[PDB]
């Protein structure tokens, strides 16, 4: 973001950089991580149920913002950071709207 | 919802009815013991299909009695009361703790807890009307009810339902 | 300890779920409870009340609807009391 | 045998019951797919069966205007069968009350379309028995349909079905 396009780039002793390239886009799955994901999804689901019970205004606001199709750079400021950081290269990102099948919070949780 | 399938029946015939013309006699018996009937496996049995070329063709005399047993195969229409989707039924009778909706053949009831608590039910109505905007219980009373579950028992069909959903109760 | 607390949690959660359901009925002559569906199949011809099969007694409704919030609050405060055990369990699962 | 619980709900995400599943076998040995039906299609075929059996009885002793038709098939029913079918009276009242097409030809054209589309049978039978012209509202009604079908395809079928069917 804040680099000049026509700077000078030098690299030193990166003769094993292919391994860094490989791990840049490689990932593993474990059982306990799956368990933690299940527990986190349940916690998020119950939190969403509680929020829908007490004040559905924020959820409806988020849902209509997704209906307009805003994104992380659209809504988030600089001082707040994205939770799930962008895993893919920005040249390959999707920039269109969220589908209605996952647009609702409960839809996305079930998804 | 209504279904079509080939189905088998199991019929006794008294030996007094061993006259020369019994095939159509059995067809008649099939009519008034298939049409207008209820079970658990197939629900309310509406009417018969394939009146011609029906499949009986053979029968065994029961050993201890002169009754002759026959096996009848036939296409028909029944009703299958599902669970979990919307029907726009009609209400004929009501109770103090909920209305009894007659969606066609059965009488599905909605408990006073199964109606939404924000529905502005007034007990001083004839019949007691659980209306908020438009779903006033009338002689017509087209109410979008979702069957909870049609609980199956011995051949007397009963169901439960609720209107705690958007456009549920509302058409 | 984990099995007992899990059993207690599931027991009380299903207690609250069951207490959110309609309370039901009973016939006090035979002292036998009756569900809402059992009331439905035991109604009178008037389509108003429900009569017992054996004692032929008009069914009287069970009293648990006010108990729903009481069991919810008992669940909440019991979780509050048990919460240090939950935190210690979390730290134990962190440990080996 | 193992007491074989098999808990199963009936919905439209291909969540179908065992007792009425799709692939059966008929008694002559040929495969028996499930026959699910539309409300207007049932409305037609009850009349078809009634006129067929009535003409069958016309040969036996020889050898679509709903207000007339319900009471006429009623008196045809108590011509031979009994008067106990009050619930069956309720059923064809329901059929003539909420069946999406009064006429046969619109139903026939819709089925002629669906025989080319090759949609899911119980899905499209539920859609046909339903009487609505709003695809997104139908998706809000049934989240099973909301998850299954795209709204664009749902409306692109719903409008070319809605222009044909008799509006109410």
UniProtKB/Swiss-Prot annotation, chain A:
Outcome following mutation: residue 13 to K: In rad3-1; abnormal sensitivity to UV irradiation, defective excision of damaged DNA bases
Transmembrane segments: none
Cystines in this chain: none
Motif DEAH box per record, residues: 12-15
Subcellular location: Nucleus
Observed effect of gene inactivation: Essential, it cannot be deleted.
Further facts: Present with 14400 molecules/cell in log phase SD medium.
Subunit relationships: Component of the 7-subunit TFIIH core complex composed of XPB/SSL2, XPD/RAD3, SSL1, TFB1, TFB2, TFB4 and TFB5, which is active in NER. The core complex associates with the 3-subunit CTD-kinase module TFIIK composed of CCL1, KIN28 and TFB3 to form the 10-subunit holoenzyme (holo-TFIIH) active in transcription. An additionnal subunit, TFB6, plays a role in the dissociation of the SSL2 helicase from TFIIH after transcription initiation.
Function: ATP-dependent 5'-3' DNA helicase. Component of the general transcription and DNA repair factor IIH (TFIIH) core complex, which is involved in general and transcription-coupled nucleotide excision repair (NER) of damaged DNA and, when complexed to TFIIK, in RNA transcription by RNA polymerase II. In NER, TFIIH acts by opening DNA around the lesion to allow the excision of the damaged oligonucleotide and its replacement by a new DNA fragment. The ATP-dependent helicase activity of XPD/RAD3 is required for DNA opening. In transcription, TFIIH has an essential role in transcription initiation.
Residues of the full protein shown: 224 to 334 of 778
Curated annotation (Swiss-Prot), chain B:
Subunit and interaction comment: Component of the RNA polymerase II (Pol II) complex consisting of 12 subunits. RPB4 and RPB7 form a subcomplex that protrudes from the 10-subunit Pol II core complex. The RPB4-RPB7 subcomplex probably associates with TFG1. Interacts with NRD1 and PAT1.
Lineage: Eukaryota, Fungi, Dikarya, Ascomycota, Saccharomycotina
Keyword tags: Cytoplasm, DNA-directed RNA polymerase, Nucleus, Transcription
Protein name, per record: DNA-directed RNA polymerase II subunit RPB7
GO molecular function list: single-stranded DNA binding; single-stranded RNA binding; translation initiation factor binding
Organism, as annotated: Saccharomyces cerevisiae (strain ATCC 204508 / S288c)
Function text: DNA-dependent RNA polymerase catalyzes the transcription of DNA into RNA using the four ribonucleoside triphosphates as substrates. Component of RNA polymerase II which synthesizes mRNA precursors and many functional non-coding RNAs. Pol II is the central component of the basal RNA polymerase II transcription machinery. It is composed of mobile elements that move relative to each other. RPB7 is part of a subcomplex with RPB4 that binds to a pocket formed by RPB1, RPB2 and RPB6 at the base of the clamp element.
PANTHER family registered for this protein in UniProt: DNA-DIRECTED RNA POLYMERASE II SUBUNIT RPB7, DNA-DIRECTED RNA POLYMERASE II, III
GO cellular component: cytoplasm; nucleus; P-body; RNA polymerase II, core complex; RPB4-RPB7 complex
Swiss-Prot record, chain C:
Zinc finger (C4-type): 27-55
Compartment(s) of residence: Nucleus
Highest taxon above the source species: Eukaryota
Family: Belongs to the TFIIE alpha subunit family.
Note: Present with 35900 molecules/cell in log phase SD medium.
Function per UniProt: Recruits TFIIH to the initiation complex and stimulates the RNA polymerase II C-terminal domain kinase and DNA-dependent ATPase activities of TFIIH. Both TFIIH and TFIIE are required for promoter clearance by RNA polymerase.
Subunit structure: TFIIE is a tetramer of two alpha (TFA1) and two beta (TFA2) subunits.
Protein name (record): Transcription initiation factor IIE subunit alpha
Species the sequence originates in: Saccharomyces cerevisiae (strain ATCC 204508 / S288c) (Baker's yeast)
Residues of the full protein shown: 98 to 193 of 482
Curated annotation (Swiss-Prot), chain D:
Molecular function GO labels: nucleotide binding; translation initiation factor binding
UniProt keyword annotations, A-Z: Acetylation, Cytoplasm, DNA-directed RNA polymerase, mRNA processing, Nucleus, Phosphoprotein, Transcription
Keyword Cytoplasm carried by entry: yes
Compartment(s) where it occurs, according to its Swiss-Prot or TrEMBL record: Nucleus; Cytoplasm; Cytoplasm, P-body
SMART domains per UniProt: RPOL4c
Source organism superkingdom: Eukaryota
UniProt GO BP: DNA-templated transcription initiation; mRNA processing; nuclear-transcribed mRNA catabolic process, deadenylation-dependent decay; positive regulation of translational initiation; RNA-templated transcription; transcription by RNA polymerase II; transcription elongation by RNA polymerase II; transcription initiation at RNA polymerase II promoter
Presence of the UniProt keyword Nucleotidyltransferase in the record: no
Self-association and partners: Component of the RNA polymerase II (Pol II) complex consisting of 12 subunits. RPB4 and RPB7 form a dissociable subcomplex associated with the 10-subunit Pol II core complex. In exponentially proliferating cells, only approximately 20 % of the Pol II complexes contain the RPB4-RPB7 subcomplex. In starving cells, that enter stationary phase, RPB4-RPB7 is associated with Pol II in a stoechiometric manner. The RPB4-RPB7 subcomplex probably associates with TFG1. Interacts with LSM2 and PAT1.
Record's protein name: DNA-directed RNA polymerase II subunit RPB4
Record organism: Saccharomyces cerevisiae (strain ATCC 204508 / S288c) (Baker's yeast)
Gene (UniProt): RPB4
């Amino acid at each position: 973001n804040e680099v000049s396009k026509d700077s000078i780039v030098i690299f030193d002793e990166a003769h094993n950089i292919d391994n860094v390239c490989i791990e840049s886009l490689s990932l593993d799955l474990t059982t306990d991580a799956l368990r933690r994901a299940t527990r986190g999804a349940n916690a998020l689901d119950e939190r969403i149920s509680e929020v829908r019970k007490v004040d559905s205004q924020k959820l409806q606001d988020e849902y209509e913002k997704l209906v307009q199709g805003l994104h992380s750079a659209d809504i988030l400021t600089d001082q707040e950071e994205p939770f799930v950081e962008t895993p893919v290269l920005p040249q390959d990102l999707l920039t269109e709207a969220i589908p209605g099948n996952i647009r609702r919070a409960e839809h996305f949780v079930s998804f | 919802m209504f279904f079509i399938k080939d189905l088998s029946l199991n019929i006794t015939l008294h030996p007094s009815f061993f006259g020369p013309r019994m095939k159509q006699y059995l067809k008649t018996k099939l009519l008034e013991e298939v049409e207008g009937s209820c079970t658990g496996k197939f629900g309310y049995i509406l009417c018969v299909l394939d009146y011609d070329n029906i499949d009986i063709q053979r029968g065994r005399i029961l050993p201890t009695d002169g009754s002759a047993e026959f096996n009848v195969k036939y296409r028909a229409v029944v009703f299958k009361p599902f669970k979990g989707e919307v029907v726009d039924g009609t209400v004929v009778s009501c109770s103090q703790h909920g209305f009894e909706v007659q969606v066609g053949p059965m009488k599905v009831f909605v408990t006073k807890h199964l109606m939404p608590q924000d529905l502005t039910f007034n007990a001083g109505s004839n019949p007691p009307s659980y209306q908020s905007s438009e779903d006033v219980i009338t002689i017509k009373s087209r109410i979008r009810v979702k069957i909870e579950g049609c609980i199956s028992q011995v051949s007397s069909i009963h169901a439960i339902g609720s209107i705690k959903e958007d456009y549920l109760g509302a058409i | 300890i984990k099995w007992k607390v899990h059993q207690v949690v599931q027991r009380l959660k299903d207690d609250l779920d069951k207490n959110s359901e309609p309370n039901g009925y009973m016939c006090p002559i035979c002292l036998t409870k009756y569900t809402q569906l059992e009331a439905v199949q035991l109604l009178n011809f008037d389509r108003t009340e429900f009569l017992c099969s054996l004692c032929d007694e008009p069914l009287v409704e069970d009293d648990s609807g006010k108990k729903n919030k009481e069991k919810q609050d008992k669940l909440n405060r019991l979780m509050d009391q048990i919460q240090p055990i939950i935190d210690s369990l979390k730290k134990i699962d962190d440990s080996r | 045998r193992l007491k074989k619980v098999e808990e199963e709900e009936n919905a439209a995400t291909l969540q179908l019951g065992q007792e009425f599943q799709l692939k059966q076998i008929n008694h002559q040995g040929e495969e028996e797919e499930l026959i699910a039906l539309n409300l207007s299609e049932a409305r037609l075929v009850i009349k078809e069966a009634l006129v067929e059996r009535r003409r069958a009885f016309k040969r036996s002793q020889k050898k679509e205007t709903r207000e007339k038709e319900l009471e006429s098939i009623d008196v045809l029913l108590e011509q031979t069968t009994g008067g106990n079918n009050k619930d069956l009276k309720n059923t064809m009242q329901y059929l003539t009350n909420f069946s999406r097409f009064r006429d046969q030809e619109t139903v026939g054209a819709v089925i002629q379309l669906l025989k080319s589309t090759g949609l899911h049978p119980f899905e499209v039978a539920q859609l046909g028995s339903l009487a609505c012209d709003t695809a997104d509202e139908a998706k809000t009604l049934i989240p099973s349909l909301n998850n299954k079908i795209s709204d664009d395809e749902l409306e692109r079928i719903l409008k070319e079905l809605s222009n044909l069917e008799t509006l109410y």
